[PDB]
Structure formats: C-alpha cells, structure tokens
Design a protein around this ligand. Structure first.
Ligand SMILES: [Ca+2]
Length: 184
C-alpha cells in the first residue's frame, strides 16, 4: 500500500479560513487529494487536488465557530494512501455571555463579550416574549459591548438578542445571534 502523509498541522486560523500543512510520505507520489467538511455534516465534503510538490493549502469560505474534519490522501496514479486526518476549528464570530446588568422600571442595561474577530457593529433586537408586539432593533459601534434599552413596560418578559456584524463583502456578515430572556 501507499504510505500516508504525516504531521498534519494548522496555522493562520481565522473565522473563515485556516492553512493546513503536512509532510510527504517516504514514497513515490503523483499528487494529494484533500477533503474537508464541518464535523457531523452528512453530505459531500469539499475537495481539492493538490500538486505533489506542495505541502500546504489554505482553506477558505469556512463557517465561523466550526470544527472541520480534514482528510489528506497521497495519490500515486491509481493508488491512494489511507487518509491523514486532522480536526481544526475556525474562530467564532458570535458574542458571548449576554446579560442584563441593571434595570429600571422601563430600561435595561445589557452587556456581553466581543467575539475574537473585528466587529464593525452589533445589532441589538428586543421584543415582548410571546407578544403580537413589534420586535425593535438598533445598533451599537463594534468597539463597545454594552447597550441600554429604554422605553420598556414594567412587569413584562422580553427576549433580547445580539448579533456581531463584520463589514467585508456585499452584505455586512452578521454572526448567528445570542439571546436571553428577562422580565422587567
Ligand atoms: Ca468534535
């Protein structure tokens, strides 16, 4: 059988990419086949054919906060090696630890922790839990991870959600949201 590559390693990890490295087998090879998929995904992995002279690839268009399974197979014409497998997560872009830090009868001060990415702005939404009531939205600058919500009703359950939004492409790229409930 054809010996596998060895020494899988990862570098330059971001929310949407990372670089994968490996060491060629002590064998004749004609190329590599690299596959990657989010863990537990039941469908087809993404695939790249890499030249035999190469020992790394940067994988892009990845989803934040996700562990990927990466498989590298050496090829020698018809033959394939068993795969060299590694698991690496991308950085999460989702805020953490959303909480109400203070309350008055009609206002809530909320606070959270920034994700480890460059946030352009946060979007805050809030509405009465279970109300036919309008959901309301506003933003805060990405440099600040607190907000004050005003104009609320006392004695009412509210759902409050925060998104971290980055501004890189055709649309802002906003994280999955984090939510809490709080009764004024
Ligand atoms: Ca896992």
């Amino acid at each position: 059988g054809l010996d596998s590559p060895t020494g899988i390693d990862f570098s330059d990890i971001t929310a949407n990419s990372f670089t994968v490295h490996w060491i060629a087998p002590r064998a004749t090879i004609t190329g590599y086949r690299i596959r990657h998929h989010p863990e537990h995904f039941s469908g087809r992995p993404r695939e790249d054919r890499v030249p035999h002279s190469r020992n790394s690839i940067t994988l892009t268009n990845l989803t934040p906060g996700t562990e990927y399974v990466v498989s590298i197979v050496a090829l020698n014409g018809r033959e394939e090696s068993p795969p060299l497998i590694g698991q690496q997560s991308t950085v999460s872009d989702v805020p953490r630890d959303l909480e109400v830090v203070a309350a008055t009868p009609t206002s809530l001060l909320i606070s959270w922790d920034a994700p480890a990415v460059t946030v352009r702005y946060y979007r805050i939404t809030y509405g009465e839990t279970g109300g036919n009531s309008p959901v309301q939205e506003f933003t805060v600058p990405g440099s600040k991870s607190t907000a004050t919500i005003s104009g609320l009703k006392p004695g009412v359950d509210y759902t409050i959600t925060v998104y971290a939004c980055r501004a890189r492409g055709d649309n802002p790229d906003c994280s999955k949201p984090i939510s809490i409930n709080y009764r004024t």
